[PDB]
Design a binder for this molecule. Sequence first.
Ligand SMILES: [Mg+2]
Ligand SMILES: [Mg+2]
Ligand SMILES: [Mg+2]
Ligand SMILES: [Mg+2]
Ligand SMILES: [Mg+2]
Ligand SMILES: [Mg+2]
Ligand SMILES: [Mg+2]
Ligand SMILES: [Mg+2]
Ligand SMILES: [Mg+2]
Lengths: 51, 125, 225, 147, 187, 128, 51
Amino acid sequence: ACARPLISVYSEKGESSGKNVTLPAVFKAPIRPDIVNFVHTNLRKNNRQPY
Amino acid sequence: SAHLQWMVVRNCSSFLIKRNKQTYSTEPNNLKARNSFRYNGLIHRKTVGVEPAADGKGVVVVMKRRSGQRKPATSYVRTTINKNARATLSSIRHMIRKNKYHPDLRMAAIRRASAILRSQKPVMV
Amino acid sequence: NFAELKIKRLRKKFAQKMLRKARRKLIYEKAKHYHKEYRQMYRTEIRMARMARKAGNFYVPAEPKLAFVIRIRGINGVSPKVRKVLQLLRLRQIFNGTFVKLNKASINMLRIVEPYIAWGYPNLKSVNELIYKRGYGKINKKRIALTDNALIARSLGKYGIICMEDLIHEIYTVGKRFKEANNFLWPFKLSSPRGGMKKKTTHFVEGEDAGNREDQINRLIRRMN
Amino acid sequence: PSRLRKTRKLRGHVSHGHGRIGKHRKHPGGRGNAGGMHHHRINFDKYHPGYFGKVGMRHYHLKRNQSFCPTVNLDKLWTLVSEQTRVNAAKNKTGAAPIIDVVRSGYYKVLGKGKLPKQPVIVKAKFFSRRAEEKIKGVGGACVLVA
Amino acid sequence: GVDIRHNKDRKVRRKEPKSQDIYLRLLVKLYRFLARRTNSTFNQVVLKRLFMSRTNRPPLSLSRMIRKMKLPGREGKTAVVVGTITDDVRVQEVPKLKVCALRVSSRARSRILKAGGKILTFDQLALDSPKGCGTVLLSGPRKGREVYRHFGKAPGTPHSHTKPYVRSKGRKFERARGRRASRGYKN
Amino acid sequence: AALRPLVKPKIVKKRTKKFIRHQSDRYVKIKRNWRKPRGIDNRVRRRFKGQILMPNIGYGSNKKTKHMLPSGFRKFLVHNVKELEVLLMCNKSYCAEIAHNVSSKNRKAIVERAAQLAIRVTNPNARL
Amino acid sequence: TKTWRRWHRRVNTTQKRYAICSALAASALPALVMSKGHRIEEVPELPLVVE
RNA sequence: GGGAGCCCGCCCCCGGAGCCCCGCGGACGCUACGCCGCGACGAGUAGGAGGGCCGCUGCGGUGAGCCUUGAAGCCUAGGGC
RNA sequence: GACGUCGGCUACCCACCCGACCCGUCUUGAAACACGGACCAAGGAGUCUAACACGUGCGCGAGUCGGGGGCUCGCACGAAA
RNA sequence: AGAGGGCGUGAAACCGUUAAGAGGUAAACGGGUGGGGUCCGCGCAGUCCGCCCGGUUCAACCCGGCGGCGGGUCCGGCCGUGUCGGCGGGUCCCCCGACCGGCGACCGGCCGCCGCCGGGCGCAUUUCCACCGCGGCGGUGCGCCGCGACCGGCUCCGGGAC
Ligand SMILES: [Mg+2]
Ligand SMILES: [Mg+2]
Ligand SMILES: [Mg+2]
Ligand SMILES: [Mg+2]
Ligand SMILES: [Mg+2]
Ligand SMILES: [Mg+2]
Ligand SMILES: [Mg+2]
Ligand SMILES: [Mg+2]
Ligand SMILES: [Mg+2]
């Protein structure tokens, strides 16, 4: 359970309103560039037509 | 974390420059334009940036507020110095040395400011 | 606090200087004693020879306990036993020198590799020049020049060897710690013999250079060191 | 990725890593498992003992459903039931001895491997082994046969 | 010309991890500093095991760790594992332990925290015990993988108990001439 | 009166002639680009006396003066003024190189900016 | 070339979720967003949430 | 802490002791996949391994990249790495 | 020493001294009176599928899995997710 | 049309001519120089600069405003981690109080410091330009050079003494 601050929402013209939302725990997940690169490279081949 | 972000950004940054054995980083607030952990204006909590003024005379000193990140619109504070090429260096030194604000970049910022002041002068014959 | 720390640091510096001065005095005294011992041995040998020659008798000098071995041929077409003996003697490159303690086992080992080596009985001047000019110690399995007594102390202090004079005394006068002192010395990298050789491929008795040259090894050392 | 493969490093080498004395021919030794008895006998006899020959009885129409009998050891028997059931044991001062059905979890035979905790159980199974029944009786349980 | 064989001059041991993940790199850098500076050999062993591959750090079972911590004398000490702590389901009573590992299974983590123990990471270990004092270093069974059952003396050799590479075990796939005394011979 | 480098040591080169391919002079289809000989009976491959030399790691230039121009700088290819401004803190050790594809309209701007920032350009008056 | 080449590659569902969580977490940390080249200088807050 | 020595007290802090060590903060050196110092060594067919900021083509991102004030391609007794 | 004088290792031509037999291949042995070869340009030869074994990286872990199927889009990016 | 109807770009093999060099051991090749051309980079000396020192306004110091840094009595609240309390709503939430990690998760005041702007501060301080000093330091000289001393490694020579 990492420290998750509060993120302020903004209106259609900027000028952040009074509503606030706590940071979801997904943004505190570990950053794994190798895993992202592996998954992206293996997944980008699935939309490929045969030749 | 500065080290965690550096591990991501050390090789796949958009400011990195290969091509003929020299590595450079053209990111803002990075003096010496060096792809180094110490000289990286994006990852560090405290950063010092010296750039020429928009008018063409003097220098602008940029320091990261560090009060709150995730808000790039307010994170950096800009201050312009326009003096007689000697009080500017003393002002920058007192900005960095006496405030204990990233003392590693003191002489680098001083040299960059000297170079910028040299640039905005008559060129040659 | 600062004044007390400064006084303590100055006292430590003075104590270290006094220790260094005492070590220097000890080294000087040991060198003087070694000079006296060498003179005594050299004079005693002549005394015994004259004493025996005065009457109708003979004085047989002692079999030398120290030998200097030089490899005088290359590394091509070497017998497996010959090369094993050579690499057990720390003689892998040509014109390499080493000190060998003489006994039955070492004499037989030198007999095996007679055509590949030229050895003899070194003098005091020979060991002095070899240890001084071309003396390298094996420290951390690295060839380090003996430019200071600190290296020799750091290596062989537990054996009472603290200066180059002690190394010369242990080598020339082989003692209890000859093995460690000799193994500490890197094998000597001697140059080619100035003035040429007689014949590399045959024994010294028949006009060549190989074999035992008991007293003539000093000339070879002078022309190679 | 052919970029990282060995064929890229062999450009410029005449034999392509297959020797220049003995070239790369089609099938010098034969195709497939040829020569198990002749000229390849040593490999078969020193790495696949019992390859040649026939042993045992034949079974013409063999059906795997008849011989289906999964086994579970007493080492992991309380895992088939919820942890709260095991927590509600050695408790209530009655000797509840909850019933464990292994056919529900997908097991027919109960084997005696492992150590059983000191708590009475009711184990219902298609078949039981002697050691498992001995362990269950010693702990203080009972074995129930279910068709 | 010097006669020295060069076939065994280059040592094959690892100097850095082959993985490209950055958290392991950060731990490697921290323990590089600790090992190169502190005289403790525990940091050296931890660095070397961090350099190791997946098969060189097999997972450590909960039951084995509990049994090792059950030995007299090593009471109230922190468990240090460079592999993965895996839950063991055939054990009921789990004591309170202090464990340090790269990975802990969800079941194992829940059972350890339920019993009142503590789970720490290696960066927390450096802060708590920089020299690794009062810690017990453990590892999983290196020969636990099924590959070692096929290694050793070849099958079909006398006094050999090595599992052969067979497509499928059965009556008529093996155990014939070469293994039956009635069929030729057996070893 | 050009911009002198920070340090101008004496550059020493083991070899200055190009390494030519074996039998490149005898045939037109064989180019000057070096190729490693691999014939079983090749004089160059087994280093016969008075033959074509083969490149070795021994010919490696000193790391102090490696990639150093005769002036004393190192080349850096520059495509625009923004890339030119990168060399502001390396002017005394590195010099800007203008790409061949840059038009003459922007080349003068790059040259003027380099003069303002005191960066040497190896091709200042190139196209005009 | 044959049409029955292994065109498509397979990735574990857990690894795909890991990669997407890592990317979602990396959407924070304005240094990483700047490193992607996005002009984020004047944005009031990088976790930009709107009504 | 106490008792004392070849009348008592001080015997102080680097925002300043100014330095061959400063335990108070620390590069011009820190692309830690970076930098720096020591020693030894350097043959090679068949073959094996590693590094290529060596070269070609196309795809996902990225150079507020280049370009009719001139892209690719081609020629060059021009300057170099 | 400085308006017909300087520096240009590499490349243009020529001369001199020393060295120097034509490449690839079979071969114990090739410059061979062994074979292929007038010259130039373009194309040109270790691939793909499946089955194994070992090593390496990643995720989960006494569990692991996506085969096939089904629910969301009318396919720009998608026959993806 | 230096794109002229098989006409975009137009390489090599090969051929004609022009300019230069050379030529009785077939040509060609490697190492080392020399001579002649091709242009390149200077220069009408290139003596190269960059700091410190000697011979028109503001820093020093005050007043006001603005922004920032660090700190602790945690000064007050939020924020936030572990335990204890109210069971108040196996896992997921609410309130006050205590301890501790007060962790860069934020503020409102206090202190010290820094920078900028506006007022003073009129000139032994302050700052630009040009010169005579080659005075102290650093990297260099446009090319050809010469000399001195010190060190390292060698080949020798002349003496004396055991
Ligand atoms: Mg021979
Ligand atoms: Mg061809
Ligand atoms: Mg041959
Ligand atoms: Mg044949
Ligand atoms: Mg024959
Ligand atoms: Mg041949
Ligand atoms: Mg023919
Ligand atoms: Mg081709
Ligand atoms: Mg045409």
